[PDB]
Structures are given as C-alpha cells and as structure tokens.
Amino acid sequence: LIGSLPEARLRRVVGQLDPQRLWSTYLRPLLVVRTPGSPGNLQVRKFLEATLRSLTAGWHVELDPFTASTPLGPVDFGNVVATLDPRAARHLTLACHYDSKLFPPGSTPFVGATDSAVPCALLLELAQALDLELSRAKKQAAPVTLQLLFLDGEEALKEWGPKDSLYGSRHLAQLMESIPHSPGPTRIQAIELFMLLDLLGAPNPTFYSHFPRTVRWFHRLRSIEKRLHRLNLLQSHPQEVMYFQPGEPFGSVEDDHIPFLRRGVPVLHLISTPFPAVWHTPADTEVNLHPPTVHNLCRILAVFLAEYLGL
C-alpha cells in the first residue's frame, strides 16, 4: 500500500527485534508486585528510567511525581515520561501503565503480566530495536518525534468508586495542559496521536476500532497484520486476520486515554476486547502469556512505528 515500507525495509526492521531481549531484559524484570507506593513499584520505576536513559538516541526522560488521596490515604505516584526529541513540534505518543493492581493481603500475588507488563516491555523493545533510526531522525530534527508514557496508578486501589482509578493519567494530562510547548500551545496539543496499549500478551486477542476519528490507523494495523501473515513473519497465526477485527467494538472501557481524550487528543485504544481470560485474577502471569502472540504484536507495532515516523 502507499506509505508502506518496501519489503526489504520491512524485513530489516523486523530483524532488529530480539525476542529474548524483549522477554528477559524488558518483560521479566517487570513481573513483580508493583502496586502504587510499594518498593516494587519504585524499583520498576527506576528500572524503566534507567533503561530508557541507556538508549543511545538520547531520550529526554523525566518523572511526574505527585501525592494523591486514595481510599488507603495519601499515596505517591510517579509517571515516567520519555520524549525522544523535546524540541519537536509534535509526537506520536505510545502509552501503557506500569503499576499492578492491589489485591488483599493473603491473596495469591498479582503481577499483571498482560495488564500491563507486556505493554511496557513492548514499548522498551520498540525503542531499543529502532534506536539507530530514531537517533538519526532526531539528529535530522524530524518535526514529529516519539514519546513513551509509562503511567502509574491506572488501577483502583480498593475498587472504591470512580475517583479510585487513573491516578497517573489524570495527573499527567492536567500537568501537560499547564506546560507551554511550541507551537503547542501546551504539551497536550503536541500529542499528534495517543496510542494506548493495554491487556496484551494473552492468546487469541481481538482488537476493534473504538474511535472513528482514528480508524485510519486501526486499518493500518490490520493491513500490517495481513501483510506480515502473507510474508511468513507471524507465528501461530493460521488465519490471515486474527487480531484486528472489523466492526463495532465488542465493548469500550475506561482507561488511561480518557483524561487525554477529554482534552481533545486523538486516541487509538489498543486493548483486547474481550479481555484476557486471566483478567484481574492472579493467574495473569508469565506462564499464561502466549509468546508467539507477544512477538507477533511486537512485529506489527515495529512496522507501524517505522511507517508512521518514516524510519
């Protein structure tokens, strides 16, 4: 299709992905209890920061720390914000949440492998696999850069009503609205597209377009799935289209995009609906992930990113 990578550039891009790196260097370290305010959450925050700072492209990496009221009293939250080129007029923003949902004491510990350790790991792997190309685009002052958001506090702490959720995204969207950007006028308007990854890594996911505004990008993802299938680049993928489905959504849900959506940001919500079978149970673990699906999604996203940013 027009603006698609030539086959030769596509196979090179896919070949820069390293499945073992994704799994062991980016995913495995996240698979700990990481509820807001916990030591594990702080350790994951520092791991994300250090990993992002290590990329040779030289990202601007900053924390958005704050304290908020919760059903458990005041709790500290910290969003990790990585912007490749902070001088660029606008950016594609890819987002996910790095907290894990708090369960009661004496429960089987919940580590949220699909929700959202896999999303987090995918963003890290994409940034690393495309690091040389991203570095060159920044050095050329490309007018659209890349931003990665690792949001804290997406999950409710006690399922205690509508304000016990989305702590990090609500705070960050309000913060961005207060910060000037050129041309902006604020950092909210710098977001050209907000792509939220959530509930990824289970077998047999299904994705629908939730926002007519951004359906062209949903169609691009679907076309990339079909193309990779026909190129013999997907595993355990017997039908041409499995993940990106046509039609009205099975259902739409509140998530970290909402504070951005409400401020006019265009959103693509890349979330499995129906949710994974393991959703919000302690069986949402590494062993219940489907590795071929994880790597297939990584490949689809890598091609999407290279096409979107002209890498």
Q: Are 181 and 270 in contact (CB under 8 A)?
A: no
- Closest distance to Zn ion from the beta carbon of 58 (Å): 33
**What's the distance, CA 122 to chain centroid?**
7
- Nearest residue (CB) to Zn ion, 104 versus 238: 104
- What is the identity of the amino acid at 176? M
Q: Does 286 appear as a known binding residue?
A: no
For 60, residues 6+ apart whose C-beta sits below 8 A from its C-beta are 82, 83, 84, 85, 86
Whole-number Å distance between alpha carbons of 65 and 42: 11
Residues 6+ apart with CB under 8 A from 180: 186, 187
Binding mask 107-126 toward Zn ion (x if CB under 5 A, else -) reads --------x-----------
Handedness of CA 22, 138, 196, 224 (dihedral sign): negative
115 annotated as belonging to a binding site for a ligand: yes
In sequence order, which ranges of 231-270 are alpha helices (DSSP H)? 258-261
Q: How many CB atoms lie within 10 A of CB 216?
A: 10
User: Is 210 one of the annotated binding-site residues?
Assistant: no
Tell me, residue by residue from 154 to 193, as one string, x for binding to Zn ion by CB under 5 A and - for no binding.
----------------------------------------
Give the SS3 label for residue 152.
Answer: coil
154 has catalytic annotation: yes
Which residue of this chain has its Cβ atom nearest to Zn ion in the complex? 115
Catalytic, 85? Answer no
| Interactions with Zn ion, residue window 213-232 (CB under 5 A) | none
Tell me how far, at minimum, the Cβ of 198 lies from Zn ion, in Å: 8
* Count, residues near Zn ion per rule CB under 5 A: 1
3-state SS assignment for residue 79: strand
Residue type, 164: D
CB 121 within 8 A of CB 26: yes
* DSSP letter assigned to residue 170: H
Catalytic one of 99, 133, 154, 284: 154
Nearest residue (CB) to Zn ion, 130 versus 199: 199
Q: Which is nearer to Zn ion, 93 or 100 (CB)?
A: 100
Half-sphere exposure in the Cβ direction for 270 (13 Å, CA): 31
Among residues 85, 152, 198, 255, the one annotated as catalytic is 198
Q: How far is the CB of 165 from Zn ion (least distance, A)?
A: 10
* Minimum gap (Å) between residue 289 Cβ and Zn ion: 15
The CB-of-112 to Zn ion minimum distance in angstroms stands at 6
Under the criterion CB under 5 A, does residue 152 sit at the interface with Zn ion? Answer: no
- What does the binding site for Zn ion look like in residue numbers (CB under 5 A)? 115
Residues with catalytic function: 154, 198
Q: Which residues are annotated as a binding site?
A: 115, 155, 280
Q: Which residues are annotated as a binding site for Zn(2+)?
A: 115, 155, 280
